[PDB]
């Protein structure tokens, strides 16, 4: 086991306000394989200026996915108050074969700050946070969303400049509003931009510290960080699991401008991941300085046959989901 730093000294947790209705929004961004949306580049071979038929793990054509969105939290004047989150922690999904994630999709455009539906602002990219594991159950007061035994946490930190991946037991804390205490509604992470994101000094531990307020980290077997370059470009994240471990994919390190996903880590996680949930984040802004944070989209992977169209430099820029409709199947059979 590994040392992951200090426990929280806080005697209670920040109060968390769940209002699903403010987060129920239809901003559809479905998979378009003709733009190679959500394609994990096939592993073990390279191709160029050619079209192959391939059987791998892909999201299917036209899948709307599940949309998630993070919001600024309550404020009064210049005083951050309760957190503002959707009902994500109780919504435990099934990992199956894994999933890919469309990150920062609506950036640069304008949208709502969620917590105040009339206020609008320029939308900025925000990275998603995940909790994955093999055993789920209830918290003490009946609520779903508690992960047992070792749990894989994927938690961006450093105002979007870092990804932390760690695999430990999550011991719920007992203070007021904590998962093992009174008036528990949901756990969340947060950071406070006034103190945590002043230029030159991004706090690389601000989100972890907030996580550490709801759970004590115990029997941790690893904790990795992955530096992330600050920009506002559309990018894709993927995760799968084999007997060799959990595999993390990103477009960001190889094909930043195209979206092809390449493996950038193998985590030594050998228990089968059967469940995951999205960890709600809330940003402790003051009222005047709220921002809009781009929704992200999570699409499940299935075994599918695709036509993959490799450009000359070797990247996939067009594809066809053979099972999509009759016309696409006609294109597939016409290459055999």
């Amino acid at each position, epitope marked *: *086991y*590994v*040392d*992951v*730093g*200090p*426990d*929280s*000294v*806080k*005697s209670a947790c920040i109060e968390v306000d769940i209002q699903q209705t403010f987060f129920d929004k239809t901003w559809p961004r479905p998979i378009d394989v003709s733009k190679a949306d959500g394609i994990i580049y096939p592993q073990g071979r390279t191709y160029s200026n050619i079209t192959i038929t391939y059987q791998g793990l892909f999201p299917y054509q036209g899948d709307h996915g599940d949309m998630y969105v993070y919001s600024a939290g309550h404020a009064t004047g210049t005083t951050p108050q309760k957190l503002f989150v959707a009902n994500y922690s109780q919504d435990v999904k099934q990992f199956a074969n894994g999933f890919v994630v469309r990150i920062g999709a609506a950036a640069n455009s304008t949208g709502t700050v969620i917590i105040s539906p009339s206020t609008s602002a320029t939308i900025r990219k925000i990275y998603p946070a995940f909790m994955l594991g093999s055993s789920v159950g209830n918290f003490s007061d009946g609520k779903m969303g508690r992960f047992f035994n070792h749990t894989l946490v994927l938690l961006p930190d450093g105002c979007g400049t870092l990804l932390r991946a760690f695999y430990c*037991i999550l*011991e719920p*804390r*007992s*203070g007021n509003h904590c998962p093992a205490g009174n008036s528990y509604t949901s756990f969340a992470t947060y950071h406070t931009p006034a*103190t945590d994101c002043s230029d030159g000094n991004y706090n690389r*531990n601000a989100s972890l*510290n907030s996580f550490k307020e709801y759970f*004590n980290l*115990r*029997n*941790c077997t690893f904790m990795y960080t992955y530096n992330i370059t600050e920009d506002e470009i559309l990018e894709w994240f993927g995760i799968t699991q084999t007997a060799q471990g959990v595999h993390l994919f990103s477009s960001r390190y190889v094909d930043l401008y195209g979206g092809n996903m390449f493996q950038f880590a193998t985590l030594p996680v050998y228990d089968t991941i059967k469940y995951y949930s999205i960890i709600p984040h809330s940003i402790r802004s003051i009222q005047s300085d709220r921002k809009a944070w781009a929704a992200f989209y999570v699409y499940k992977l299935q075994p599918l046959t695709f036509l993959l169209d490799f450009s000359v430099d070797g990247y996939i820029r067009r594809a066809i989901d053979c099972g999509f409709n009759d016309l696409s199947q006609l294109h597939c059979s016409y290459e055999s």
Partner: antibody, heavy 123, light 111 residues
């Protein structure tokens, strides 16, 4: 001789009732902001009483109910020092006060203690 | 809010005999496979020293005559066989949840 990690509390104090006193705890030999500093009151007829603790990374604090008001915990990163200020002093506060470091993994214990600050409140 | 009880208050023991100190918590101090109970030894004019952490682990330099044991709410420190250097006061503390608390202490004297 000496060990690598040391907590060196400030000197001893004699003050009048109603005063306040502010004692320091200067750490050395470890990364100052990854270890919480806890404070403990020791008076002859109560043993050890936990007061509270501070996280030097973001200034967060915790107190036990009997001390939420009497004590105020602060830290300085540059000097690697932790401070405890006691206000509204009565005779019931004459005691030796300790700072100690919580070791994180493993143990989760008070692995290292300062030598104690003697505070006396004479009527 | 866990409260620690130590017994006895003081005890005197002959060289080479066994000393047993008990600690009881008002509420279980067990989670995640640990018992968040620690023992400190304190000599006069000095600060406490950590002896045992997480119920039964000896800190480095602490001889094996100290044996810590127990789980949940009831713990005991045994010293066997006691040497002249073991005259101290022993304190238990839990770290299960905040606020942390210590026991009253047990003063051990040797003949």
């Amino acid at each position: 001789g000496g060990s690598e990690v040391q907590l060196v509390e400030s000197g001893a104090e004699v003050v009048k009732p109603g005063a306040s006193v502010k004692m320091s705890c200067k750490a050395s030999g470890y990364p100052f902001t990854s270890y919480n500093i806890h404070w403990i009151k020791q008076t002859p007829g109560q043993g050890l009483e936990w007061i509270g603790a501070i996280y030097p990374g973001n200034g967060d604090t915790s107190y036990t109910q009997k001390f939420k008001v009497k004590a105020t915990l602060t830290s300085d990163k540059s000097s690697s020092t932790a401070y405890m200020q006691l206000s509204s002093l009565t005779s019931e506060d004459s005691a030796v006060y300790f700072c100690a470091r919580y070791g994180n993994y493993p143990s989760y214990a008070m692995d290292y203690w300062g030598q104690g600050t003697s505070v006396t409140v004479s009527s | 809010d866990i409260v620690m009880t130590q017994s006895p208050a003081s005890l005197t023991v002959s060289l080479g005999q066994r000393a047993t100190i008990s600690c009881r918590a008002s509420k279980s101090v067990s989670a995640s496979g640990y018992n968040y109970l620690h023992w400190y030894q304190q000599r006069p004019g000095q600060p406490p020293k950590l002896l045992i952490y997480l119920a039964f682990n000896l800190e480095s330099g602490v001889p094996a005559r100290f044996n810590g044991s127990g789980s949940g709410t009831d713990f005991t420190l045994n010293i066997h066989p006691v040497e002249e250097e073991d005259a101290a006061t022993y304190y238990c503390q839990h770290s299960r949840d905040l606020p942390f608390t210590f026991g009253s202490g047990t003063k051990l004297e040797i003949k």
